[PDB]
Amino acid sequence: WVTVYYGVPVWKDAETTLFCASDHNVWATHACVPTDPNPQEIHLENVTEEFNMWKNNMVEQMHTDIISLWDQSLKPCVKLTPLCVTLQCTNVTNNITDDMRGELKNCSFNMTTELRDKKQKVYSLFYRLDVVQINSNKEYRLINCNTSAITQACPKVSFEPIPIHYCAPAGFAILKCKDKKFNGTGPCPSVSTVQCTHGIKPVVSTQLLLNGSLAEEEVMIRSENITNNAKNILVQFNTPVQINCTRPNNNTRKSIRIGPGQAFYATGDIIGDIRQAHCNVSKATWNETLGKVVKQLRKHFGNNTIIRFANSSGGDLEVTTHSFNCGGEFFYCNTSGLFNSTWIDSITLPCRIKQIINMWQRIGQAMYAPPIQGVIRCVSNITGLILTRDGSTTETFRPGGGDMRDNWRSELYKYKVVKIEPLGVAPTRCKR
Amino acid sequence: EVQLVETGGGLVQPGGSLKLSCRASGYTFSSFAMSWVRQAPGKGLEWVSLINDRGGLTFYVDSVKGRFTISRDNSKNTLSLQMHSLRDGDTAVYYCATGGMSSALQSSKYYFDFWGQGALVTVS
Amino acid sequence: FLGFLGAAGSTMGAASMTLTVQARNLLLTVWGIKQLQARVLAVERYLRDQQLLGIWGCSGKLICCTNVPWNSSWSNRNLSEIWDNMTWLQWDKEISNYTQIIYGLLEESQNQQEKNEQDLL
Amino acid sequence: FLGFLGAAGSTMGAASMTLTVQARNLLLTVWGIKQLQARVLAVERYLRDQQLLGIWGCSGKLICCTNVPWNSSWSNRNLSEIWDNMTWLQWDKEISNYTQIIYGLLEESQNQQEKNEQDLL
Amino acid sequence: FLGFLGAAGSTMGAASMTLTVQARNLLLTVWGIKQLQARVLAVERYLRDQQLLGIWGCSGKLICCTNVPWNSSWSNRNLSEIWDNMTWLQWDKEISNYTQIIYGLLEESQNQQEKNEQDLL
Numbered sequence: 067w068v069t070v071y072y073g074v075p076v077w078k079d080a081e082t083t084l085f086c087a088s089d090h091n092v093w094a095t096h097a098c099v100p101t102d103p104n105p106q107e108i109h110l111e112n113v114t115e116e117f118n119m120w121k122n123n124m125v126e127q128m129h130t131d132i133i134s135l136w137d138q139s140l141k142p143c144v145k146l147t148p149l150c151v152t153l154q155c156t157n158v159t160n161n162i163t164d165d166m167r168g169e170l171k172n173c174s175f176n177m178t179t180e181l182r183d184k185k186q187k188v189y190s191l192f193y194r195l196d197v198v199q200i201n202s203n204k205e206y207r208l209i210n211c212n213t214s215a216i217t218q219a220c221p222k223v224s225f226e227p228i229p230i231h232y233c234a235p236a237g238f239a240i241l242k243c244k245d246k247k248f249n250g251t252g253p254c255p256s257v258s259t260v261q262c263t264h265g266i267k268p269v270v271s272t273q274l275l276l277n278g279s280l281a282e283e284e285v286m287i288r289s290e291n292i293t294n295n296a297k298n299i300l301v302q303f304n305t306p307v308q309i310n311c312t313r314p315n316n317n318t319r320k321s322i323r324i325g326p327g328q329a330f331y332a333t334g335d336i337i338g339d340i341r342q343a344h345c346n347v348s349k350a351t352w353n354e355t356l357g358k359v360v361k362q363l364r365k366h367f368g369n370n371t372i373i374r375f376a377n378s379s380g381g382d383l384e385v386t387t388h389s390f391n392c393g394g395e396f397f398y399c400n401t402s403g404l405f406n407s408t409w410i411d412s413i414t415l416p417c418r419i420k421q422i423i424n425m426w427q428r429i430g431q432a433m434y435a436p437p438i439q440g441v442i443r444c445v446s447n448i449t450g451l452i453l454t455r456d457g458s459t460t461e462t463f464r465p466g467g468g469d470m471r472d473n474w475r476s477e478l479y480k481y482k483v484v485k486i487e488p489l490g491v492a493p494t495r496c497k498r
Numbered sequence: 499e500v501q502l503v504e505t506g507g508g509l510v511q512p513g514g515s516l517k518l519s520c521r522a523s524g525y526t527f528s529s530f531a532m533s534w535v536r537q538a539p540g541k542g543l544e545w546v547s548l549i550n551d552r553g554g555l556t557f558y559v560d561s562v563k564g565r566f567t568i569s570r571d572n573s574k575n576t577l578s579l580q581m582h583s584l585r586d587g588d589t590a591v592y593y594c595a596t597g598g599m600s601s602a603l604q605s606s607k608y609y610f611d612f613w614g615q616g617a618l619v620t621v622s
Numbered sequence: 623f624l625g626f627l628g629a630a631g632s633t634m635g636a637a638s639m640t641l642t643v644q645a646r647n648l649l650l651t652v653w654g655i656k657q658l659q660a661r662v663l664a665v666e667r668y669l670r671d672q673q674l675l676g677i678w679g680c681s682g683k684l685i686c687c688t689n690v691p692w693n694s695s696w697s698n699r700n701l702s703e704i705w706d707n708m709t710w711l712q713w714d715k716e717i718s719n720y721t722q723i724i725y726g727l728l729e730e731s732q733n734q735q736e737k738n739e740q741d742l743l
Numbered sequence: 744f745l746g747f748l749g750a751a752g753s754t755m756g757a758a759s760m761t762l763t764v765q766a767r768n769l770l771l772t773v774w775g776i777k778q779l780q781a782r783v784l785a786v787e788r789y790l791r792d793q794q795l796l797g798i799w800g801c802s803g804k805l806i807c808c809t810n811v812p813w814n815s816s817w818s819n820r821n822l823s824e825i826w827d828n829m830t831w832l833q834w835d836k837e838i839s840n841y842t843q844i845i846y847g848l849l850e851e852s853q854n855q856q857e858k859n860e861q862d863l864l
Numbered sequence: 865f866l867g868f869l870g871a872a873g874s875t876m877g878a879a880s881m882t883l884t885v886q887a888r889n890l891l892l893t894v895w896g897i898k899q900l901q902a903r904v905l906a907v908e909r910y911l912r913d914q915q916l917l918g919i920w921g922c923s924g925k926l927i928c929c930t931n932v933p934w935n936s937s938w939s940n941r942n943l944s945e946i947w948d949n950m951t952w953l954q955w956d957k958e959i960s961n962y963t964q965i966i967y968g969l970l971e972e973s974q975n976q977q978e979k980n981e982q983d984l985l
C-alpha cells in the first residue's frame with residue numbers, strides 16, 4: 067500500500083540566496099551571470115498561491131546587495147582627506163541670475179602636491195549646500211569634516227541603473243503573480259513559474275518613483291495597512307508622466323594633482339550665464355494622472371470624502387525633496403508644485419544640486435561626486451508615487467520616502483520564492 | 499449506456515488466420531482494461547485474453563498463448579484479436595468485454611462489467 | 623507539454639507522469655562565497671533525498687512500490703479521491719503530520735528484508 | 744596495463760573493459776574561491792551523469808542494456824565495424840547529431856516500464 | 865536505543881543492525897572558505913564511497929553479498945569468533961593489510977559478471 071514518489075510538484079515558502087544575472091558599472095559588472103536569451107515561463111493551471119509583498123525577503127536581499135555593490139565601487143577610489151581645509155570663499159556674482167544669488171561659492175585653499183615638501187594654492191566652485199561657515203567671515207569648511215571621511219567617486223564608473231535579473235538556485239523556484247488588480251496580499255490565481263525575474267533597474271529616488279514598470283489596467287493603491295497612518299502608500303500609475311530635468315550651466319572641469327597618482331576633480335569657472343536647475347512636468351498629464359489616483363483612493367476612504375494633496379513635511383533635504391541621480395549629478399527638487407490641490411504650459415520644479423552625498427541613510431561614509439562637464443539634460447518616466455496619509459470628512463496626502471526598500475518592493479511585489487520538495491508518499495495498490 | 503460491437507470474419511479454414519475487432523463507445527475507452535471470452539457452441543464461457551488500459555501488458559490463456567495476439571488502440575476506441583493457426587476446438591462466439599484487470603492506482607475489478615454480443619467464428 | 627511544475631495544479635494521477643521534469647531541475651570574493659554556498663546547498667539537499675531513498679530500498683527509481691501497509695488513520699480516503707480529485711499540494715497538507723511516522727516505517731521494513739535476503743543466500 | 748585513457752586509441756570492444764579506470768578519475772581567499780569552484784564543479788558534473796543514468800534505469804551500472812531499438816539512420820554500420828574497427832573518439836563524432844534524440848528515447852522507455860512494473864504488482 | 869556509534873563496543877553481529885544510524889550521519893570571507901571546505905569535503909568523501917560500492921555491484925545496499933571467496937590467509941577465524949566475539953574496531957585492525965587486495969578482487973568479479981549478463985541478453 068505505501069508507495070514512494072520522487073519528483074513530485076510540491077513546494078513550500080522559503081528564504082534563500084538568489085543570484086544576479088544580466089544581459090564600469092557601480093553595481094553589476096562582470097560579477098554577474100549572463101542571462102538566458104530565451105528564458106522560460108510556465109503557466110500553472112489551477113494554482114492559487116498566497117503572496118505578501120510586505121513580507122517578501124527578496125526586497126531585503128536586494129537592499130543589501132545594492133549597498134554592498136555600491137561600497138565596493140568606492141573602495142579603490144581617491145581619498146579626499148587633504149581637502150578638509152579652511153576655505154576662503156566669496157560669492158559667484160558673474161552673470162548670476164536672481165534665482166541663484168548666493169548659491170555658488172568661489173573658494174580658494176592650500177592643497178597638497180605630488181611632492182610632500184610643496185603646497186599649491188588652488189580654487190574651485192562649491193555649492194552652498196556643500197560648505198559650512200565657520201568662525202574670518204569668509205572662512206568655510208566642507209560640510210562632512212566633523213562627521214566623516216570623504217572619498218571621490220572614480221569618474222569612469224557610471225551610475226546608470228543598468229537592470230539586474232534575480233535568479234533562483236536549483237531546488238528553488240520563483241513564482242510570479244500575473245493577476246491584474248493584485249494589491250500585494252492574499253491569494254491570487256494566474257501564477258506562473260519563472261527562471262528569473264524581469265530586469266529591475268536599481269533606480270534610487272524619493273517621493274516619485276522613476277523609470278519603473280506600469281500597472282496593467284488602472285492606477286493601483288497598495289499599502290500594508292490602509293487604515294494605519296504610520297504606513298506608506300505605494301501608488302502605481304498605469305500611464306507614465308514624462309518629466310524633463312536639467313542643469314543649464316556649461317561647466318568645465320579641472321584636475322588638481324593632490325599626490326603621487328591621485329587627483330581631485332574640481333569645478334572650474336562656469337561658461338556663459340548661471341541659471342537654476344529644474345524639472346518640467348506637463349501640467350495636463352499630471353492633472354489627469356492625479357485624477358486617476360484620487361478616483362482609486364476613494365475606494366478606501368469614501369466617494370464623498372474630500373481628498374487633499376499637500377507638500378512634504380519639514381526635515382532633512384534628502385527626505386523633503388525629490389532626490390534623484392541623473393547625468394551623474396545629484397538633484398534635490400521641490401515638489402510642492404505637484405502636490406498642492408483639493409481633489410484634483412508645464413509645472414516647473416526648482417532644484418538644488420549637491421556634490422557631497424551621504425548615501426542611503428548612513429553616517430560615516432561620504433562621497434564626493436566629481437562634476438560633469440557640459441550641460442545635463444534628462445528625460446524620465448514618473449511611474450508611481452510614495453504617499454503618506456496625514457490624519458473627519460477629509461484626508462491629506464503628502465509625499466514620502468527615504469527608505470529605499472519601498473522603491474524595490476514596488477517591482478518585486480509579483481515575485482515569491484519557494485522551495486521544491488520532491489519526495490512524497492501516497493497509498494496505492496501494489497506490493498513490493 | 500455503453501456499447502461494444504464485435505466485427506470480423508466468421509468462417510475460416512484450420513491452419514489459417516483471422517482478425518476480430520471490437521468498437522467501443524459511451525465510456526472513456528482509455529480508462530478500462532479489456533478482455534476476450536469464448537462461448538463454446540454448446541458449453542460455457544472461457545477466458546482467452548486480457549489487455550491493459552494503456553495497451554502495454556497482455557495476458558493469455560495457455561491454450562492460445564503461442565497463437566493469439568491481443569492489441570489495443572486508444573485513439574480509435576478499438577480492440578483487436580489476431581488469431582493464427584486456428585483449430586477446430588477454437589470454434590466459439592468471441593465476446594468483447596470491459597473489465598478484467600485494474601490500473602493499480604484505482605480500485606480493482608477482477609470481474610467483467612460490460613459485454614458485447616459476440617462474433618461467431620467457425621473453423622472448418 | 624508544460625515543463626517544470628506544469629502539473630502542479632493537476633490531479634495526483636495526472637501528475638506523476640512528469641516526475642523526470644521536476645527531478646532534472648534539482649541538479650568580489652563575497653559574491654564568490656554567496657554563490658558557492660547556494661551551489662553546495664543544492665548538492666547537499668539532493669544527496670540527502672537520494673540517501674533516504676537508498677535506505678528505503680528505492681534507489682534508482684522515481685516510482686517505488688514498498689512493503690509497508692497504509693494505515694487508514696493517516697488518511698481515510700479511497701483511491702478514487704486521492705488519485706483523481708486531489709493534487710499533490712493538497713495531499714501534502716493532508717498528511718503532513720504523518721510523514722515522519724511513515725518514513726520510520728519504510729526504513730524498518732527495508733532493514734528487515736535486507737537481512738532476510740542474506741539468510742536466503 | 745595502461746591506466747587512465749590508455750584505451751583511448753583502442754577499438755570500442757577492446758576498450759569498454761577499462762570503464763572503471765575512467766570512472767574512478769571523475770571523483771589568499773581568491774585562490775580559495777578558485778579551488779572550491781573547481782571542486783564543486785567536479786561534483787556537479789558527476790551527479791548530473793548519475794541522475795541521467797538513473798532516469799534511464801541504468802543506476803549502479805557501467806554497462807546498461809536498454810529496451811530502445813537502434814535506428815539505422817543514426818549509423819548504418821554493422822557490429823563488426825563498430826566494435827572491431829572504430830575507437831570511441833571516432834564513434835562519438837559519427838553520432839554526435841543523434842545524441843539528444845537517443846537520450847530522449849531512453850527516458851521515455853524507462854517511464855513506460857516503470858509504470859508497467861507498478862501495474863503488475 | 866543508542867544513536868550514532870552506540871554499537872561501537874558491540875560485537876560485529878550485534879552491530880550491523882545499526883547501519884542506517886551511521887550512514888545518516890555522513891550527510892569574514894576566511895570563515896566562509898573554511899566552512900565551505902569542510903562541507904565540500906564531506907560531500908566528496910561520501911561520493912567516493914558510493915562510487916566504490918557501485919563498481920562492486922552493491923549500489924543502493926547497506927549489506928551486500930558478493931561473489932568473491934574468502935581467503936583464509938586474510939583471517940583464519942571461524943564465523944563464531946568474528947561475528948560473536950569481535951567488534952568492528954578490532955576487526956578493522958586485524959585485516960587492515962588486506963583491504964586493498966579485497967577491494968581489487970571485488971572490482972574484478974563485478975566486471976566479469978557485468979559482461980556475462982550482457983552475453984545472456
Ligand SMILES: *[C@@H]1O[C@H](CO)[C@@H](O[C@@H]2O[C@H](CO)[C@@H](O[C@@H]3O[C@H](CO)[C@@H](O)[C@H](O[C@H]4O[C@H](CO)[C@@H](O)[C@H](O)[C@@H]4O)[C@@H]3O)[C@H](O)[C@H]2NC(C)=O)[C@H](O)[C@H]1NC(C)=O
Binds near residue numbers: 276392394444445
Ligand atoms: C530613466 O531612463 C532614461 C532612459 O531609459 C535615462 O536617461 C538616459 O540617461 C543617460 C545618462 O544621463 C543618457 O546617456 C548620456 O547622454 C549624454 C548626452 O550628451 C552623453 O553625453 C552621455 O555619455 C557620457 O557619459 C558616459 C558615462 O559612462 C560616457 O561613457 C560617455 O563617453 C560620455 O562621457 C550619456 O550617453 C541617456 O541618453 C538617457 N536616455 C535618454 C533616452 O535620454 C534616465 O536617466 C532614467 N532616469 C533616472 C532617474 O535614472
Ligand SMILES: *[C@@H]1O[C@H](CO)[C@@H](O[C@@H]2O[C@H](CO)[C@@H](O)[C@H](O)[C@H]2NC(C)=O)[C@H](O)[C@H]1NC(C)=O
Binds near residue numbers: 198212213
Ligand atoms: C558638524 O557641524 C555641523 C555644523 O555646525 C553641526 O550641525 C549643526 O548642529 C547644531 C546643534 O544645535 C544645529 O543647530 C545646526 O543646525 C546644525 N547644522 C546643520 C547644517 O545641520 C553637526 O552637529 C556637527 N556634527 C558633530 C558630530 O558635531
Ligand SMILES: *[C@@H]1O[C@H](CO)[C@@H](O[C@@H]2O[C@H](CO)[C@@H](O)[C@H](O)[C@H]2NC(C)=O)[C@H](O)[C@H]1NC(C)=O
Binds near residue numbers: 172189
Ligand atoms: C573665482 O576666484 C578666482 C580667484 O581666486 C578668479 O580667478 C581669477 O579671475 C581673474 C579675472 O581676470 C584673473 O585675472 C585671475 O588670474 C584669476 N585667478 C586665477 C587663479 O586663475 C575666478 O574667475 C573666480 N571665479 C568665478 C566664477 O567667479
Ligand SMILES: *[C@@H]1O[C@H](CO)[C@@H](O[C@@H]2O[C@H](CO)[C@@H](O)[C@H](O)[C@H]2NC(C)=O)[C@H](O)[C@H]1NC(C)=O
Binds near residue numbers: 400401402403
Ligand atoms: C518649495 O517651492 C515653493 C514654491 O516656490 C516654496 O514656497 C514658498 O515658501 C515660502 C516660505 O514661507 C512662502 O512664503 C512662499 O509664499 C512660498 N511660495 C509659494 C508660491 O507658495 C517653498 O518654500 C519651497 N520649499 C523649500 C523647502 O524651499
Ligand SMILES: *[C@@H]1O[C@H](CO)[C@@H](O[C@@H]2O[C@H](CO)[C@@H](O)[C@H](O)[C@H]2NC(C)=O)[C@H](O)[C@H]1NC(C)=O
Binds near residue numbers: 280306445446447
Ligand atoms: C516611458 O514609458 C513608455 C511606456 O511604457 C516607454 O515606451 C515604451 O517602451 C517599450 C519598450 O519595448 C515599447 O515597447 C513601447 O511601445 C513604448 N511605448 C510607447 C508609447 O512608445 C518609454 O520608453 C518610457 N520612457 C523611459 C525613459 O523609460
Ligand SMILES: *[C@@H]1O[C@H](CO)[C@@H](O)[C@H](O)[C@H]1NC(C)=O
Binds near residue numbers: 160338
Ligand atoms: C557675461 O556673459 C557675456 C557673454 O558674452 C560675457 O561677455 C561677460 O563677460 C559675462 N560677464 C562676466 C562678468 O563674466
Ligand SMILES: *[C@@H]1O[C@H](CO)[C@@H](O)[C@H](O)[C@H]1NC(C)=O
Binds near residue numbers: 155156157167168
Ligand atoms: C553671498 O550672497 C549672500 C546672499 O544672502 C550674502 O548674504 C553673502 O554675504 C554674500 N557673500 C559675500 C562674500 O558677499
Ligand SMILES: *[C@@H]1O[C@H](CO)[C@@H](O)[C@H](O)[C@H]1NC(C)=O
Binds near residue numbers: 152153154174187
Ligand atoms: C595658504 O598658506 C598661506 C601661508 O602664508 C596663507 O597666507 C594663505 O591664506 C593660505 N591660503 C588660503 C586660501 O588659506
Ligand SMILES: *[C@@H]1O[C@H](CO)[C@@H](O)[C@H](O)[C@H]1NC(C)=O
Binds near residue numbers: 250288
Ligand atoms: C488586498 O486584497 C485582499 C484580498 O482579500 C484584501 O483582503 C486586502 O484588505 C486588500 N488590501 C487592502 C489595503 O484593502
Ligand SMILES: *[C@@H]1O[C@H](CO)[C@@H](O)[C@H](O)[C@H]1NC(C)=O
Binds near residue numbers: 291293294
Ligand atoms: C491596521 O491599523 C489599525 C490602526 O490601529 C489597526 O488597529 C489594525 O489592526 C491594523 N490591521 C491589522 C491587520 O493589524
Ligand SMILES: *[C@@H]1O[C@H](CO)[C@@H](O)[C@H](O)[C@H]1NC(C)=O
Binds near residue numbers: 311344412414
Ligand atoms: C521648462 O519650461 C520652461 C518654460 O519656458 C522652459 O523654458 C524650460 O526650458 C523647460 N525646461 C525643460 C527641462 O525643458
Ligand SMILES: *[C@@H]1O[C@H](CO)[C@@H](O)[C@H](O)[C@H]1NC(C)=O
Binds near residue numbers: 310346347348412
Ligand atoms: C520633454 O522633452 C521632449 C522632447 O525630448 C518633449 O516632447 C516633452 O514635451 C518634454 N516634456 C516636458 C514636460 O517638457
Ligand SMILES: *[C@@H]1O[C@H](CO)[C@@H](O)[C@H](O)[C@H]1NC(C)=O
Binds near residue numbers: 349353354410
Ligand atoms: C484638472 O482637471 C479638472 C477636471 O475638471 C479641472 O477642473 C482642473 O482645473 C484641472 N486642473 C488643472 C491644473 O488643469
Ligand SMILES: *[C@@H]1O[C@H](CO)[C@@H](O)[C@H](O)[C@H]1NC(C)=O
Binds near residue numbers: 369370
Ligand atoms: C460609492 O461607490 C459605491 C459603488 O457601488 C456606491 O454603491 C456608493 O453609494 C458610493 N457612495 C457614494 C457616497 O456615492
Ligand SMILES: *[C@@H]1O[C@H](CO)[C@@H](O)[C@H](O)[C@H]1NC(C)=O
Binds near residue numbers: 377378380386400402
Ligand atoms: C510646503 O509649503 C509650505 C507653504 O507655506 C512651505 O512653507 C513649506 O516649507 C513647504 N515644505 C517643503 C518641504 O517644501
Ligand SMILES: *[C@@H]1O[C@H](CO)[C@@H](O)[C@H](O)[C@H]1NC(C)=O
Binds near residue numbers: 402403406407
Ligand atoms: C497652491 O494652490 C494655491 C491656490 O490658490 C496657489 O495660490 C499656490 O501658488 C499654489 N502653490 C504652489 C507652490 O503652486
